Symmetry: T
């Protein structure tokens, strides 16, 4: 009666490209987070070691969320190492052992870079699909929380 | 002191139109749940088990969604109708066919019916968002969850 | 030695029809239970709200059990909205908000109707397949428990 | 290589708006516990239990808001004096209160809390939609609590 | 260097102490049995809350009776929780037969919880004088049961 | 539309039969705890632990039966005086009892409890097969407990 | 007082015939468990994973069932024999073939062997029910659980 | 045979007893509020450990305040945990505003925990004299809070 | 750059045969363990009953581990009743009820037989694939623990 | 209004109090070590029950030793749980070497549990006089250990 | 007394060669994890769901493995490099192709890449075992877990 | 039928080697708890918590080794006197110790414990590779603990 006949959302390829930008930075952040997690040394090692894993957990869940949102709307994600390295906007993480103080500053900057990407694409994403912007909001919130939890170590008052 | 002095402070009340838009979402979510179980029981053929299991996950989400929408209506002083006669008379989903259906047919059928459910939510979205962005927040989660289900189900039939 | 050769239970279509009768009433009960769960208001709202969800949980598990028992014996269930509405024996649940006292009486009657269907088909089911009657017994027990738990609210002694 | 060679900061007004939500969430939590302990009469147990769920949500909410402030370089103040001095919630009364009275009282004070979030919503959303996302969850959860509590007093 | 070179016997309860814990035990078991009776036979306004709270009371009283009985065993005393002994020696007013209204059950159970607590409070000082470690267990029981009493009786309180 | 425009009630005899099962289940539970506390000697711990599992099953069983009575408009009586006055179980002795004695005693009293359920089974099944379903679960569980306990005393 | 006065009250004792009927059920449940694992390891081809996983669920149920039946025998003073030689010499199930088997073949093979196991339980049912309805209660659960497994497995091969 | 034939009233707290538990309650609630303030606003060396430990302290103080308040209710006393009352009657030194260093927070919170414990220790003997079962709850609180104090203050200890 | 081209461990059939020897003895042990679990009677029945189930749990997990290791290396396990009975090295478990003392000695011997098979094939397995020997070590350790836990019942000191 | 304006110091244990808890600590640690020794080396009739019960005893004694040691820290006292100190200062009779029969182990461990409890009972009143909150923890330990003693010793009881 | 008297006792230090061998294992495990997720998102076609799910299990194991190896390096005073540029420049795995891939293609592709990862571990095994058998213990678990994944994935494509 | 018609026993040297590992594992556990209680200063909480994880691993390890000895007909001695008299670990000091000192002290004593396992490894592996399997897990876990603890004191 209100039933429709069988003959049954299309996202633009630009929209997919915007999600792809978010994806590579989330993957890069997870990879750098693990690097820091392994190679951080010095005062308050353990807290940083543990917090960095929490960050990585969130970034990995986030990248799965974004990639699978792309798939739901029939976009095609690319999370391959070469693509991530070639297209990420995050500054490269330095090699070797790094002091806890250095790691705090480095990782804060890299989180902030990842968040910036999401904030940069937000309005274009929101205009086409507010339901995707919903996921972006959760990511921004969770990442900016991680930034606060990590950077607070270096704050002098 | 910054304390308010009213003895009675009323809550947010939904307009009749708003209540109607959520009612439209509700009946389609319930219908999708009923069709989801029908497919879950009656799917046969290649890759039976995966579809059987995925369809239950879809049903779980749709049932949680219908409860969320109906209870959101109650929170905003609107009154849901999820009775079988109403669902049958007012759902926009194409009817699920009778009897056993092949895995390939079930994939196509259920994908279409999820698409129909999501379309209802997307149709009322802007009007809902305009009156109450907090309800739109719930609609966003529903759209995301359902379109995820659509991908997880439909991909069975997608070739190369 | 005691091994049989490869060349290997058939239920009647009437038996399937009997399970179908149980199925539609279980689904209808779940749908009405949710309606009541949302729309119940008044004294002792919370207990009814919560108990009605427990009833719905049991009825949903029950309808899955029956439908899948049908499938196991190669019967074909029909739990579609139109079929449920057109064939259920349960009295229609009234529209709008209902008082807790009214809901107690209404839902008790609808549980009792569902149980009656199972009791009506029991002997025919038991005669053909005692293993199915086993499931019927569990349902009757669980539903009649729910009836007691709900109706006790209105009992005056 | 697309790699860049980086400080979002809340405006004072934005921080002030979240501070307003915070004190009402904390006050609601304190009032919820007061009601939880002191409610008496017909259907005591349901109210007792539901009020604790309200408090659980409101406490999670206040932590969420305060930590969002921290994330955006704002500084929360959830101290007792500040809460008492700046909360917009009508004062919850002392002593034993009937279930009927508690239902009415708590519904009003939840509604007051939601009103604050609804008042600041548009300004918060204009500056930071990600924070408004949190406000939506709070509005939804609290208005649900209001429905679950107030339905007890509904006549027909 | 400081090692003892003794068999080292454990602390043994006096007959008075044993008797005092036996008194607590029978009232805890009686309360459990009456709690179930009420759990099953309560009817009327707010049935579900009372039905559920009565089971929590029974859970606590059963754990309590086990705790006391095993405390007796630990101190070389012998519990008797048999039906005849409980019926013959409990201080609790008899629970009435048949279906009982929620209002009636609230009043009845509150009274029986209070009777159980009274028994524990009556023996407390004598128990505490001999073995403060056992008084520790009595404190937990008094606290838990008086909590149950408040949670139940508040239903009937009219303000 | 097949929609109808509705009161199963147990006969007094049926209710009486379930009452018989109930008092024996409760008595078994009380005796099980008595044994649980007072058993001593070789293999104490196993018996101590197994007896608690017996009590757990018997308590769940008594609740199941009493609530089945309620479901069918019957009224249980599980009070101490009634249990002592109407139970068919041989009295469990007071004081410390050896593991060997406890095994024999408890097996007898489980068997007595099962015998009651087996005695009323056919009459219960004739009126309500759904209740007999519950009796079967009880018979199975209790006879399992009897086997797990009595095997301790088996000679070869 | 209504207390009985016997010092020794014996339990229910199964007849030799009853003990034999449960023994028949036992060996087929164990054989099904062994064949279930064989198929679980050696299934290859289209939809491998679903069958691999479902076969373990079947094995879990059959193992729980064999324990239930053997322990029911013990409860009724009967003595089970679940040794490999006895199972091999007295099972009624057709032999599972050797080596790797295709998903389609495994579906057909295992369905047949579940059907065989259920047939044994249905064959002894009435004789078991006549002596002890409480044991028949267990048989009912076994039949229901196993026929559910049969449906969940066989549906892979059912076309349209 | 031994069954009582009375309504049997429960144990009722004296006004002094009620007042004493109210004193404990407001300090527990104040400590909770200050604990969250510190949880949010702590910055500097070893932030995370302090952030996390402060939440554990708050968890314990919240459970504690609920326990005390419900103990009051069980004994027919009436708690007041409202913001105005807590602010007006707490004995805790005010927590300062704004971001505070980890070193500062350690010292500040240790002092406020100690103040809370002091209140409990001050009322203890009077509570114990009337109701040892309540003193039982006070012992758990003193133990838990003094543990929290050790776990926090050890950060600033220089050996 | 270090990437290999697409055109990509092969175990000998003798290696597979060695794992097969372990498999049949693990399955036989599980079957005998259940037999003992059901039919053990007498002093300390309960401990033996419970410990025998723990043994069976370990042996069942072990046989799955070995069979699936065979599959991973493209060997083909045979755990069928006839094959197990015809090829197991374990002494037959006796029929009927057995005393706890007898069961202790019997099961200890059968565990020791199963362990002996693993120890006999160890060096040949280790030489070809140390990663498989890794699994053998876990099994030997777990089984010899079970042997100690069971046999200690009969130890007189 | 009622806020204090002080640094507020915590409760500090006297040297006698510290010494008394140290005595409890070494006996709890010794009991744990002997419990494991027995856990590993027990053989004979009813091995499994004893093997398993001995681990439960060790679990309780380890939690107990941690509780006491951290209670010392909370009150500004310093524990010493090192091997040499425990060996040199424990009051427990030495556990014998090699495999021991279940009957022997029951008697041996019962004696060593009783020795541990005796230490706690000996210091109790002095601890209770200074700090009833610590006596609260001692009551839990006495209760738990005497329960373990009953559960173990009952194996050897012949009636 | 048998107590040692040194104030400082150093831990086991890995040779540069040993550190390099574990680094080789690390980059291939990370690369496998990245490719595993790519396949997990982009697989389409017959039996989509099973592969989708199994690929996540593979990713979970590989991620746990990379962490284990990197942390083992840290324990032995070696310094891991799991950065994207390094992984891309030094992994031995063939590149995963772009875009959506069929279930059959993904099975073949991923099996090959697991085989490649395992080959790296087997190549460095003997040199690792020679210096530190405790690290070889970890390599054994990795090889076993990964070859299990290979079987569970590849069996989809194996015919009769 | 391939059915056989059966006593692995450790040599005294093998048993002695496992005894050496056992006493160092127990001593490490006791020292870990001492450090857990008495550590003070900057980053107290992390050290406090990490030391308990070390103790957890070392206790599981000592039980594993002692029970492996039992499995192979050897007899462990984990008594206090024996541990104090035969452990190779440098004595842990009494009294409060700074986090920096505890890091250095505990790292040394973990390294001492690992050294013992590494010293006996080859002899153990030659006789019983299945026991060496357990030693590998212990070496891996303890050296991980050493890294997690010592990293606190690392300069750059
Ligand atoms: Cl509730
Ligand atoms: Cl699956
Ligand atoms: Cl932490
Ligand atoms: Cl046990
Ligand atoms: Fe995913
Ligand atoms: Fe709901
Ligand atoms: Fe289902
Ligand atoms: Fe927080
Ligand atoms: Fe007990
Ligand atoms: Fe119940
Ligand atoms: Fe079993
Ligand atoms: Fe509470
Ligand atoms: Fe498997
Ligand atoms: Fe600790
Ligand atoms: Fe890690
Ligand atoms: Fe152990
Ligand atoms: Mg939004
Ligand atoms: Mg928006
Ligand atoms: Mg039946
Ligand atoms: Mg209620
Ligand atoms: Mg005292
Ligand atoms: Mg035993
Ligand atoms: Mg029948
Ligand atoms: Mg190895
Ligand atoms: Mg006390
Ligand atoms: Mg599949
Ligand atoms: Mg080797
Ligand atoms: Mg830290």
């Amino acid at each position: 009666s209100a039933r429709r006949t069988e003959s049954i959302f299309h996202a633009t390829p630009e929209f997919g490209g915007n999600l792809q930008k978010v994806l590579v930075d989330l993957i890069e952040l997870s990879l750098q987070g693990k690097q820091a997690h392994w190679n951080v040394v010095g005062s308050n090692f353990r807290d940083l070691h543990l917090q960095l894993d929490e960050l990585v957990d969130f970034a990995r869940e986030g990248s799965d969320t974004i990639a699978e949102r792309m798939r739901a709307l029939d976009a095609v994600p690319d999370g391959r190492s070469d693509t991530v390295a070639a297209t990420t906007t995050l500054p490269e993480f330095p090699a070797f052992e790094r002091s806890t103080a250095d790691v705090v500053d480095l990782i804060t900057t890299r989180i902030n870079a990842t968040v910036d990407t999401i904030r940069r694409v937000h309005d274009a994403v929101d205009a086409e699909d507010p339901s995707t912007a919903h996921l972006l909001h959760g990511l921004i919130d969770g990442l900016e929380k991680q930034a606060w939890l990590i950077r607070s170590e270096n704050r002098k008052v």
